[PDB]
Design a protein around this ligand. Structure first.
Ligand code: NA
Length: 410
């Protein structure tokens, strides 16, 4: 099958009739040789690029369909941004403008490198994979080669078996950086206890924090019961003059460079002074808002995250409240604005509670617009209507989108 790629689909794959072609983009003239059935979709196993779309970076990226590394690496950056606006609108029927990442290389502040018998890779969960070789798409750090050399040296000295997909001593090397502080946390994720304390400390002597996280299951997901091996308990990231604390056990917004744009977006959409920030994390939005004079209550399920937020508040002299709990059970009355940042599965049934008891301004933060619009169509629209929306490109070179949607009551 030969033809011209007409659009990209929701997951950022180029469409060729009833074929999906990874790394092909709109305008490409392609020739597909092998396809593979994938849960009722036909996906191109490889293609030859006959004619480059005008969207591609001129050079090698206009001669080969797969320049390398990242699914969208071959698209010029401005052109990726417009394709993100298109997808968002196609999914939600909202026209939202996107703000680019101030920096489009080495922007992520975390990486879970999986350690396999086939060697070390950037892990991502889910099947239209978007970062397939981090050597040809350096989205994380300039120190990545030093992080990996260290790990290899440690696996030498500590004779320790990688993940062979059924078992293995070690499983992931998690590295986290504070982009604006220099601090580096190293978190080995393992299926055995640490024996080579000295070998590990030596290999990662440059890290400010070394952890060893013990997994109690064999599942392929990067989480444990962490043990400080050496150095600081946490690392610091600094954004908009706010010191945030990062622990192996917590989630933090992924792009320290685009994060000011997410913070100012949310602020622009706030209404009144009393803000409830559910899924409040290690205080990313809450501290930013409260520091700017909002009265801010944040609720987060992860207890370690909530501690981090409390400590940040002290460090920064911010006046705000932080509570452990599930967003499902937080009291919504008495507020002017509600922010939600749900996980990928969305609000789900919490929407009925928001429909009844929610405040006048609802702000919804979603890295997954298909799930947003479904929450909206299925529940929120009863009570709410979209008033405004912005996009932030937190994940350059890949089709992922971070949306900030402002809804108000009818
Ligand atoms: Na990298």
């Amino acid at each position: 099958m030969r033809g011209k790629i007409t659009k990209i689909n929701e997951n950022g794959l180029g469409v060729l009739g009833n074929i999906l072609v990874p790394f092909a983009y709109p305008g490409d003239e392609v020739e597909v040789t092998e396809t593979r059935e994938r849960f009722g979709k036909i996906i191109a196993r490889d293609f030859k690029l006959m004619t480059p779309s005008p969207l591609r970076i001129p050079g090698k990226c206009s001669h080969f369909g797969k320049c390398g590394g990242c699914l969208w690496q071959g698209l010029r950056y401005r052109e990726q941004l417009k394709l993100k606006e298109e997808i968002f609108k196609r999914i939600t029927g909202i026209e939202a403008e996107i703000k680019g990442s101030p920096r489009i290389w080495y922007f992520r502040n975390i990486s879970n490198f999986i350690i396999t018998v086939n060697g070390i890779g950037f892990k991502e969960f889910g099947m239209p994979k978007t970062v397939v070789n981090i050597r040809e798409c350096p989205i994380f750090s300039e120190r990545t080669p030093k992080y990996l050399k260290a790990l290899k040296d440690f696996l030498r000295e500590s004779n320790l078996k990688p993940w062979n997909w059924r078992e293995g001593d070690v499983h992931y090397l998690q590295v986290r950086e504070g982009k604006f502080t220099g601090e580096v946390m190293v978190n080995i994720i393992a299926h055995v206890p640490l024996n080579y304390r000295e070998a590990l400390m030596e290999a990662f002597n440059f890290a400010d924090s070394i952890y060893w996280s013990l997994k109690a299951d064999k599942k392929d997901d990067p989480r444990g019961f962490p043990t400080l091996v050496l150095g600081n308990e946490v690392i610091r990231e600094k954004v908009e003059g706010i010191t945030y604390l990062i622990h192996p056990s917590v989630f933090f917004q992924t792009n320290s460079y685009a994060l000011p744009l997410l913070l100012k977006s949310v602020e622009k959409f706030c209404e009144g002074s009393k803000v409830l920030d559910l899924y409040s994390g290690i205080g990313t939005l809450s501290l930013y808002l409260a520091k700017r004079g909002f009265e801010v209550t944040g609720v987060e399920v992860n207890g370690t995250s909530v501690e981090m937020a409390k400590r940040s508040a002290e460090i920064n002299s911010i006046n705000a409240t932080f509570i452990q709990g599930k967003a499902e059970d937080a009291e919504l009355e008495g507020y002017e604005t509600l922010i939600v940042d749900p996980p990928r599965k969305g609000l789900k049934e919490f929407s009925r509670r928001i429909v009844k008891k929610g405040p006048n301004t609802l702000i919804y933060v979603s890295c997954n617009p298909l799930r947003f619009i479904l929450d909206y169509r299925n529940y929120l629209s009863e009570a709410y209507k979209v008033d405004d929306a912005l996009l932030i490109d937190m994940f350059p070179h890949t089709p992922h989108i971070e949306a900030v949607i402002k809804l108000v009551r009818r």
